[PDB]
Design an enzyme around this catalytic site. Sequence first.
Site, PDB file in Angstrom:
ATOM      1  N   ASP A 194     -26.076  -2.908   8.273  1.00 50.44           N
ATOM      2  CA  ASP A 194     -24.857  -3.603   8.738  1.00 50.44           C
ATOM      3  C   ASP A 194     -25.216  -4.993   9.245  1.00 50.44           C
ATOM      4  O   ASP A 194     -24.747  -5.371  10.330  1.00 50.44           O
ATOM      5  CB  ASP A 194     -24.149  -2.748   9.780  1.00 50.44           C
ATOM      6  CG  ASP A 194     -22.712  -3.173  10.060  1.00 50.44           C
ATOM      7  OD1 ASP A 194     -22.149  -3.936   9.272  1.00 50.44           O
ATOM      8  OD2 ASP A 194     -22.218  -2.735  11.070  1.00 50.44           O
ATOM      9  N   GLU A 223     -17.775  -0.749  24.112  1.00 51.93           N
ATOM     10  CA  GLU A 223     -17.700  -1.935  24.986  1.00 51.93           C
ATOM     11  C   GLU A 223     -19.118  -2.406  25.230  1.00 51.93           C
ATOM     12  O   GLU A 223     -20.029  -1.539  25.385  1.00 51.93           O
ATOM     13  CB  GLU A 223     -17.126  -1.552  26.348  1.00 51.93           C
ATOM     14  CG  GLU A 223     -15.679  -1.146  26.314  1.00 51.93           C
ATOM     15  CD  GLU A 223     -15.116  -0.768  27.671  1.00 51.93           C
ATOM     16  OE1 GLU A 223     -15.907  -0.580  28.648  1.00 51.93           O
ATOM     17  OE2 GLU A 223     -13.884  -0.655  27.742  1.00 51.93           O
ATOM     18  N   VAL A 224     -19.310  -3.704  25.380  1.00 50.52           N
ATOM     19  CA  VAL A 224     -20.596  -4.204  25.910  1.00 50.52           C
ATOM     20  C   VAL A 224     -20.308  -4.952  27.203  1.00 50.52           C
ATOM     21  O   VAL A 224     -19.373  -5.790  27.212  1.00 50.52           O
ATOM     22  CB  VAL A 224     -21.363  -5.077  24.917  1.00 50.52           C
ATOM     23  CG1 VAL A 224     -22.664  -5.560  25.520  1.00 50.52           C
ATOM     24  CG2 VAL A 224     -21.647  -4.336  23.629  1.00 50.52           C
ATOM     25  N   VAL A 279     -18.200  -8.278  27.882  1.00 47.96           N
ATOM     26  CA  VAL A 279     -18.419  -9.401  26.923  1.00 47.96           C
ATOM     27  C   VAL A 279     -17.991  -8.989  25.507  1.00 47.96           C
ATOM     28  O   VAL A 279     -18.119  -9.804  24.572  1.00 47.96           O
ATOM     29  CB  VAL A 279     -19.863  -9.913  26.987  1.00 47.96           C
ATOM     30  CG1 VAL A 279     -20.155 -10.496  28.368  1.00 47.96           C
ATOM     31  CG2 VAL A 279     -20.871  -8.812  26.624  1.00 47.96           C
ATOM     32  N   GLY A 280     -17.427  -7.798  25.333  1.00 45.20           N
ATOM     33  CA  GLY A 280     -17.026  -7.312  24.006  1.00 45.20           C
ATOM     34  C   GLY A 280     -16.397  -5.936  24.098  1.00 45.20           C
ATOM     35  O   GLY A 280     -16.892  -5.083  24.902  1.00 45.20           O
ATOM     36  N   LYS A 281     -15.338  -5.719  23.320  1.00 46.04           N
ATOM     37  CA  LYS A 281     -14.544  -4.469  23.325  1.00 46.04           C
ATOM     38  C   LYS A 281     -13.963  -4.326  21.926  1.00 46.04           C
ATOM     39  O   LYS A 281     -13.373  -5.308  21.424  1.00 46.04           O
ATOM     40  CB  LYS A 281     -13.488  -4.503  24.431  1.00 46.04           C
ATOM     41  CG  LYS A 281     -12.887  -3.161  24.815  1.00 46.04           C
ATOM     42  N   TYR A 341     -16.174   0.187  18.302  1.00 43.05           N
ATOM     43  CA  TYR A 341     -17.571   0.610  18.634  1.00 43.05           C
ATOM     44  C   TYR A 341     -17.652   1.151  20.070  1.00 43.05           C
ATOM     45  O   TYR A 341     -18.442   2.079  20.340  1.00 43.05           O
ATOM     46  CB  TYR A 341     -18.620  -0.507  18.456  1.00 43.05           C
ATOM     47  CG  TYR A 341     -18.410  -1.765  19.255  1.00 43.05           C
ATOM     48  CD1 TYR A 341     -18.913  -1.908  20.540  1.00 43.05           C
ATOM     49  CD2 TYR A 341     -17.701  -2.828  18.719  1.00 43.05           C
ATOM     50  CE1 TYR A 341     -18.695  -3.062  21.274  1.00 43.05           C
ATOM     51  CE2 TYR A 341     -17.488  -3.995  19.431  1.00 43.05           C
ATOM     52  CZ  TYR A 341     -17.985  -4.110  20.716  1.00 43.05           C
ATOM     53  OH  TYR A 341     -17.737  -5.260  21.398  1.00 43.05           O
TER      54      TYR A 341
HETATM   55  C1  LIG Z   1     -24.339  -6.759  18.479  1.00 45.25           C
HETATM   56  O1  LIG Z   1     -24.829  -5.593  19.165  1.00 45.25           O
HETATM   57  C2  LIG Z   1     -25.122  -5.686  20.506  1.00 45.25           C
HETATM   58  C3  LIG Z   1     -25.068  -6.879  21.190  1.00 45.25           C
HETATM   59  C4  LIG Z   1     -25.389  -6.948  22.555  1.00 45.25           C
HETATM   60  C5  LIG Z   1     -25.328  -8.271  23.285  1.00 45.25           C
HETATM   61  C6  LIG Z   1     -26.476  -8.699  23.939  1.00 45.25           C
HETATM   62  N1  LIG Z   1     -26.545  -9.893  24.586  1.00 45.25           N
HETATM   63  C7  LIG Z   1     -25.423 -10.635  24.605  1.00 45.25           C
HETATM   64  C8  LIG Z   1     -24.221 -10.262  24.027  1.00 45.25           C
HETATM   65  C9  LIG Z   1     -23.079 -11.220  24.136  1.00 45.25           C
HETATM   66  C10 LIG Z   1     -22.833 -11.837  25.354  1.00 45.25           C
HETATM   67  C11 LIG Z   1     -21.776 -12.753  25.416  1.00 45.25           C
HETATM   68  C12 LIG Z   1     -21.009 -13.042  24.333  1.00 45.25           C
HETATM   69  C13 LIG Z   1     -19.901 -14.036  24.527  1.00 45.25           C
HETATM   70  C14 LIG Z   1     -19.737 -14.988  23.346  1.00 45.25           C
HETATM   71  C15 LIG Z   1     -18.602 -16.007  23.575  1.00 45.25           C
HETATM   72  N2  LIG Z   1     -17.607 -15.499  24.559  1.00 45.25           N
HETATM   73  C16 LIG Z   1     -17.967 -15.804  25.973  1.00 45.25           C
HETATM   74  C17 LIG Z   1     -17.337 -14.068  24.421  1.00 45.25           C
HETATM   75  C18 LIG Z   1     -18.607 -13.240  24.657  1.00 45.25           C
HETATM   76  C19 LIG Z   1     -21.249 -12.417  23.078  1.00 45.25           C
HETATM   77  C20 LIG Z   1     -22.274 -11.487  23.009  1.00 45.25           C
HETATM   78  C21 LIG Z   1     -24.135  -9.033  23.342  1.00 45.25           C
HETATM   79  C22 LIG Z   1     -22.851  -8.565  22.716  1.00 45.25           C
HETATM   80  C23 LIG Z   1     -25.787  -5.808  23.239  1.00 45.25           C
HETATM   81  C24 LIG Z   1     -25.826  -4.597  22.519  1.00 45.25           C
HETATM   82  O2  LIG Z   1     -26.234  -3.406  23.108  1.00 45.25           O
HETATM   83  C25 LIG Z   1     -26.417  -3.338  24.510  1.00 45.25           C
HETATM   84  C26 LIG Z   1     -25.495  -4.560  21.174  1.00 45.25           C
HETATM   85  O3  LIG Z   1     -25.519  -3.375  20.478  1.00 45.25           O
HETATM   86  C27 LIG Z   1     -26.797  -2.943  20.046  1.00 45.25           C
END
Ligand SMILES: COc1cc(-c2cncc(-c3ccc(C4CCN(C)CC4)cc3)c2C)cc(OC)c1OC
Lengths: 289, 283
Positions: free
Chosen positions: A126, A14-15, A7-9, A12
């Site tokens: 941040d 990847e998540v 869901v993110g790259k 930092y």
């Molecule tokens: C900021 O930081 C951290 C965030 C998270 C996190 C937790 N729940 C949901 C998310 C998420 C899910 C899905 C989208 C979608 C949005 C629209 N489109 C479809 C692309 C993607 C975005 C975000 C995330 C990124 C986990 C973290 O750590 C495990 C984080 O770091 C501490």
Amino acid sequence: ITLLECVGKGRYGEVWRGSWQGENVAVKIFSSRDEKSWFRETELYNTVMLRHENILGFIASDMTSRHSSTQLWLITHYHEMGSLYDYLQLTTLDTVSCLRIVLSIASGLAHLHIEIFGKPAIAHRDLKSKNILVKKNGQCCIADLGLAVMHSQSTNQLDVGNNPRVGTKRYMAPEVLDETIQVDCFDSYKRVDIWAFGLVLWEVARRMVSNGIVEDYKPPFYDVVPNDPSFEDMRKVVCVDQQRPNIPNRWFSDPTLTSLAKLMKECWYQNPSARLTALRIKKTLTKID
Amino acid sequence: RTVARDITLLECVGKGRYGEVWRGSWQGENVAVKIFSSRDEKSWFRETELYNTVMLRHENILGFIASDMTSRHSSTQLWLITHYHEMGSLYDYLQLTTLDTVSCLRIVLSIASGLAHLHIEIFGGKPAIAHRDLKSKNILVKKNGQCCIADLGLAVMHRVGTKRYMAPEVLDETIQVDCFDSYKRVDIWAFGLVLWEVARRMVSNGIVEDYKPPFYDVVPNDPSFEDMRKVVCVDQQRPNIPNRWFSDPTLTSLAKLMKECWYQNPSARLTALRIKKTLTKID
Ligand SMILES: COc1cc(-c2cncc(-c3ccc(C4CCN(C)CC4)cc3)c2C)cc(OC)c1OC
Ligand SMILES: COc1cc(-c2cncc(-c3ccc(C4CCN(C)CC4)cc3)c2C)cc(OC)c1OC
Ligand SMILES: COc1cc(-c2cncc(-c3ccc(C4CCN(C)CC4)cc3)c2C)cc(OC)c1OC
Ligand SMILES: COc1cc(-c2cncc(-c3ccc(C4CCN(C)CC4)cc3)c2C)cc(OC)c1OC
């Protein structure tokens, strides 16, 4: 744990959305370039009394290694609505939804800033709309404690950690961009958070409809800096040009947006000690309708 | 992709104030799991911060696998996961087992090897590391007869140490605390005590000493800081070298070596690299 989709790259790491014991979880795998953030976040999440409805909930942290390869993992609650940044792109807000979002962020930030006698006082360093997640109840939670600073009133101890990482350039306070910030002063770090909070308030308020009008989503300073602004691009507009985000004149017709504009100006004084406290922002937002 | 994180805890092999160590199983392989007490959380954070800075890998250093932090209702659970050495600690091993010349030298040279690896800065690499709690309970025996050094919870890169093993400058509080080499010299003192504990268990001419801990004859169990200071700093006592050692060339050389780890003046003590060289010329 089963990793189901990225869901993110970014730089930092990847998540991943993953499955664990039948529940969605978020699994962050840090880049080796950001190893000090992983350890700092882990130090912060050790604190049981950090837990709060408006702070991203921690499940586990791991450092794993065989031979010369190390992996760094943070596992949290998953918020399928994504970040506030994502949410504001294509959703507009009414008065109730706009105040619920910003009060929840203020509630999270006041919880970080205020010491519990336990949980130390914490400055985030941040804060930005990508570091705020939206929850199905319409409240948000603050994420990413890798740059956080901690302070203990009882022993006058300041723990600034070991992390060469710096804040997101677009959200950096004047004293961060001109590097005059007082590094041994805990109140300095809280005041950086207040600056960034004002910028997040502005990003949210633009998406609240009044009198049939709404602004498109834009990031702070979109109009005055290059795409992918450098530290020096931001220093120019904030420190040299003394620029602040513009207040659309349509806001002054709406009492809520007029009150929010007043609040975001009290976050943006060049003099850091002039800025509102997180507790005062929370109390003001609790009173606004 | 699947991340199989579960570790089955099978039997408790250690319980103290630090917490517990368990034999556990991961994907059919033994691992050792140290579960930290609230009392000793900082040892978990220090070892984790060190391994996050440098992934130490050496045959004579206990092999790191993982550091885990797990959120619980009312507490944080902290585990360190390492290689498992079924023979247990050198302390344990020396209680029942006697040594021959080859096994004695292999034990002490392996410990010197691990300690020199910690102490040495490698450029391009690893920072220099001082252990700060070297003792026979913090050394594991491997099946191949070599040992490995455990517990970097007090280690310093460039809780207090076990009192029985404290160098004179630690007990008299004259250690130059800002000076990294001071911490290497504290480890060398402790190494010399471990070398004495091992050497006693080496048979020569049909004779062996019983296992005893350093200073067993001059301090109580759980000696106080003051008990140790009076022996080591005021009276300047050192462990006894038995006459029988002087009939055996190996134990004669090892007695000389341990003397050169126990000088009152920290800067006179041998370096770990000099100890290794000396040991490779014994026998
Ligand atoms: C900021 O930081 C951290 C965030 C998270 C996190 C937790 N729940 C949901 C998310 C998420 C899910 C899905 C989208 C979608 C949005 C629209 N489109 C479809 C692309 C993607 C975005 C975000 C995330 C990124 C986990 C973290 O750590 C495990 C984080 O770091 C501490
Ligand atoms: C924590 O500990 C253990 C972990 C594992 C394990 C499980 N999955 C995958 C891996 C792995 C694969 C590939 C890379 C590299 C390869 C080359 N390049 C492209 C960079 C990436 C790294 C890691 C490992 C090491 C196994 C273990 O034992 C069999 C472990 O020991 C207990
Ligand atoms: C989170 O927690 C624990 C995880 C594990 C574990 C289990 N399977 C596979 C892994 C694995 C290793 C390495 C990669 C690499 C592959 C190459 N790619 C380019 C980067 C990533 C992927 C997966 C791990 C780390 C074991 C644990 O205990 C021993 C854990 O708990 C402490
Ligand atoms: C020094 O400290 C640490 C040690 C260890 C560790 C690693 N392998 C094996 C052991 C062990 C196994 C078995 C016995 C006994 C029990 C079975 N039988 C009745 C006789 C022999 C004793 C000891 C340990 C204790 C791990 C650690 O961290 C995870 C340690 O901390 C850094």
